[PDB]
Design a protein around this nucleic acid. Structure first.
Lengths: 155, 158, 61, 121, 108, 74
RNA sequence: AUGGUGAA
RNA sequence: GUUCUUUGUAAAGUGCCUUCGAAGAGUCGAGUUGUUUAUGCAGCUCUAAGUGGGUGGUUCCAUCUAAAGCUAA
RNA sequence: GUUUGACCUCAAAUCAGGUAGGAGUACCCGCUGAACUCAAUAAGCGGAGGAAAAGAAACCAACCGGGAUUGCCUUAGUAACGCGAGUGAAGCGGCAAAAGCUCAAAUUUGAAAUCUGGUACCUCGGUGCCCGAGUUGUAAUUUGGAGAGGG
């Protein structure tokens, strides 16, 4: 029988809210290798012949995502359920709850990574966004963090 | 980093979560062959602190050894025998059973150009390190040899 | 065997971050690690071994 | 096996003593291969060992006494633009977001501008 | 049964190796400066003896850096400390004399 | 030596979070149950046999009292 | 005793 | 020595002011059972700490930071 | 939208790029180990090089501290043991040589900046292009001698 600390996944965000979260994340897809390379080539050509606002992108790497967490810099955290090493993500929801940061779980690590170029991403987070982020956070809260606040129970 | 938390989580092995994980993984390991390739290390923190890296050329193996010679050294030798072209740099525990013990072993390919082209691991390609586990030069082998620090006929011409 | 867990620690929220690491200038500077690649591409273009992007379109015969 | 082999000459005994002092042509000029390492060092007036030797036992040095950057084009243009905009007012240059994109401190600004002026008067 | 028949041969080989290192290491004295040390075991404390390398404190007091000292061929002992002012002063004077006597060619 | 190994708050937080998420091992469960049903002396005597060094058992038993007290408050 | 040899 | 290149708001060191500031777990350890020249290793139940821990001798002191690895002489 | 692709895993190749068997074995590294305490000897097993191994202290030290590892003399036929046959070292001291160090470990997040393979040029490799590995972590910056951010 699964312990109460396990099975927190599998029970994940609903269809509509998950789709909305995916759509919101698609608005800040990080520049891919080809796009970054072509942009750098264009910049070099412009400078070689004849100073920009800070960029924004989704956070995906586990190490730096956790680094942003604990510092309270993570506005939202999205976690995959089918990750093979469960211990990598067992403590992440607990850390997010302790730090007071919204968090959510999704089914399919590959689908999580498809919005961040990489084949798989395990977890994802956002640092900056326009205004639908607050509504999405409220929906995620009311649908998973407060409705299923009894995750500590059952087996 | 996640490793800072993963190490502490793995420290409390008797905890419910790790107890469930071990009993879940024991059946999967048993269903596998005696020696089989592992796509990724089940204990990434341990492997990473053991000098293993995810770059190309690194291979993780797993092997089952009967319980009841040092088990770690026997497992290393067994994996090296099948993996003739690989070098058994180190191995570590992952799971134990009543009748069998499971130890994960990380292998480094010396023939791969990636391993030879970096100065941090090119030393392993030298012929001196061939069959390192056979001579017990690994961490388990050195410990078994008793290479501790401290207390723990000749005739000249005149 | 079947008992619930206790959220004794997951009930209060920290205010100050766990670490007071100083803020690095790089976070406030336009990606010097990227200006390095930009200048490398500039050097390659100067050497003539890299074709400007415009010539790529102008030579699609 | 030696019986079969008898049924690749290499000479090196003499070449293992006549070692050339290739590490320094200056020393080689005054070096004497007929003397020992310690004798040669004493002849050249140079110490042979920093520690007390075991057991029993300066023109050359004069010939050894004789032996004893700018801004990048883009950086130079940027510094010239800053100097034209503000001159010597480093405080104003510090807050000049248009040109001080990297937020250079008051010290680095002057350190670069002095070198820029060195080649521009 | 080991017999040291090659004693003369071993001495000749050692001398040849020393001469070869002298040819390779002509400007330097082959060895590195080492500090003066007092032995333990009061049977031997009365007699001073050489050491492995100077402590970081001694190098700092001498007016140079650990890396610069190493490039100047000065032995460094990171794990050794100073407990007596006499030995520290002797090491400082030795380092000062060595620095005054040495001449370093340019990196060219 | 010039470094002992101060917790620096970061390790404190990490270990507390690990202890909370991982719960209590059967040894810790029994220790707390006997504290609530026997006493500190009984807990120490049980730890001295379950664990190795006497000082390590004493420190863990003392820490369990605080863990129970603070945990039951909230 | 070690390691091999063969036989109805 | 001879040379063609030297560069891009590129890299390093040092003293001053200031803020931050980690450490190899079924591992040490412990009991037993076999080996060892009364150290160590191995099988096995338990298996922990980080102003913590390992080795020693005097009323608790001296040194070091293990459970990863490379390295000519 | 009962169609689909991803991710994870399991198989196949007269596919491309790669490697281990065997021999020698004086020396070396581990397992096993017999008899006139004999002996951690011999034989047997597995693995390597020109040396092998060890190597930069959870070392020795009770001193007015030494300071990687290994060899010689000495310590010493002493400490210690079986006091009985026999076994039997180690610090310090002198000699030959000396070298340092690398990752886990704290955010590169204003840019996975990393690398294998295929292709066109000049070839113990370098450049452009394409794919793949990579985020379940590839480069620089930190390995306790601390170290990082800034002025």
């Amino acid at each position: 029988k699964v312990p109460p600390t396990i099975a927190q996944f599998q029970y994940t965000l609903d269809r509509n809210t998950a789709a909305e979260t995916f759509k919101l994340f698609n608005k800040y897809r990080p520049e891919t290798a080809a796009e970054k390379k072509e942009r750098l080539t264009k910049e070099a050509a412009a400078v070689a012949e004849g100073a920009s606002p800070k960029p924004y992108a989704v956070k995906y790497g586990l190490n730096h995502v956790v680094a942003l967490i604990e510092n309270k810099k993570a506005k939202l955290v999205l976690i995959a359920n089918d990750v093979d090493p469960i211990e990598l993500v067992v403590f992440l929801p607990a850390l997010c709850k302790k730090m007071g940061v919204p968090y959510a779980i999704v089914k399919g690590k590959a689908r999580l990574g498809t919005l961040v170029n990489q084949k798989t991403s395990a977890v994802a987070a956002l640092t900056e966004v326009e205004a639908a982020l607050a509504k999405l956070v409220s929906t995620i809260d009311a649908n998973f963090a407060d409705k299923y606040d009894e995750v500590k129970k059952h087996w | 980093g996640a490793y800072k938390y993963l190490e502490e989580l793995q420290r409390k092995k008797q905890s419910d979560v790790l107890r469930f994980l071990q009993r879940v993984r024991v059946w999967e390991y048993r269903q596998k062959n005696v020696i089989h390739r592992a796509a990724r290390p089940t204990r990434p923190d341990k492997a990473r602190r053991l000098g293993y890296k995810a770059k190309q050329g690194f291979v993780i193996y797993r092997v089952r050894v009967r319980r009841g010679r040092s088990l770690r050294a026997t497992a290393e030798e067994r994996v090296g025998r099948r993996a003739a072209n690989l070098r058994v740099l180190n191995s570590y525990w992952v799971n134990q059973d009543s009748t069998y013990k499971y130890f994960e072993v990380i292998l480094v390919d010396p023939q791969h150009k990636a391993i030879r082209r970096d100065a941090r691991y090119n030393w392993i390609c030298d012929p001196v390190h061939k069959h390192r586990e056979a001579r017990g030069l690994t961490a388990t082998g050195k410990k078994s040899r008793g290479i501790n620090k401290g207390h723990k006929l000749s005739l000249w011409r005149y | 065997p079947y008992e619930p867990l206790i959220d004794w620690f997951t009930r209060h929220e920290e205010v100050m971050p766990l670490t007071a690491v100083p803020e690095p200038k790089r976070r406030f500077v336009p990606s010097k690690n990227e200006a390095k690649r930009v200048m490398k591409i500039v050097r390659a273009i100067r050497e003539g071994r890299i074709i400007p992007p415009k010539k790529l379109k102008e030579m699609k015969e | 096996r030696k019986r079969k082999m008898n049924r690749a000459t290499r000479r090196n005994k003499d070449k293992q003593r006549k070692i050339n002092i290739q590490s320094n042509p200056i020393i080689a000029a005054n070096w004497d291969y007929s003397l020992t390492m310690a004798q040669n060092y004493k002849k050249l007036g140079l110490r042979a060992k920093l520690q007390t030797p075991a057991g029993g036992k300066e023109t050359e040095v004069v010939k050894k006494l004789e032996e004893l950057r700018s801004q990048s084009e883009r950086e130079e243009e940027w510094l010239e633009k800053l100097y034209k905009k503000h001159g010597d007012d480093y405080k104003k240059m510090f807050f000049d977001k248009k040109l001080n994109i990297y937020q250079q401190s008051e010290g680095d600004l002057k350190r670069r501008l002095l070198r820029w002026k060195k080649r521009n008067g | 049964v080991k017999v040291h028949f090659d004693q003369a041969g071993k001495k000749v080989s050692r001398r040849n190796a020393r001469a070869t290192r002298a040819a390779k290491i002509a400007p330097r004295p082959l060895d590195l400066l080492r500090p003066v040390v007092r032995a333990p075991t009061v049977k031997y404390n009365r007699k001073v003896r050489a050491g492995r390398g100077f402590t970081l404190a001694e190098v700092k007091a001498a007016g140079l850096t650990a890396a610069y000292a190493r490039t100047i061929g000065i032995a460094v002992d990171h794990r050794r400390q100073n407990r007596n002012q006499e030995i520290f002063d002797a090491n400082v004077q030795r380092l000062k004399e060595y620095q005054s006597k040495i001449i370093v060619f340019p990196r060219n | 030596s010039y470094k002992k190994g101060a917790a620096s708050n970061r390790t404190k937080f990490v270990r507390s979070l690990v202890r909370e998420i991982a719960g209590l091992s059967p040894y810790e469960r029994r220790l707390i149950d006997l504290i609530r049903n026997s006493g500190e002396k009984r807990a120490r005597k049980v730890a001295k046999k379950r664990l190795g060094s006497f000082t390590r058992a004493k420190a863990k038993v003392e820490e369990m009292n605080n863990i129970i007290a603070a945990s039951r408050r909230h």
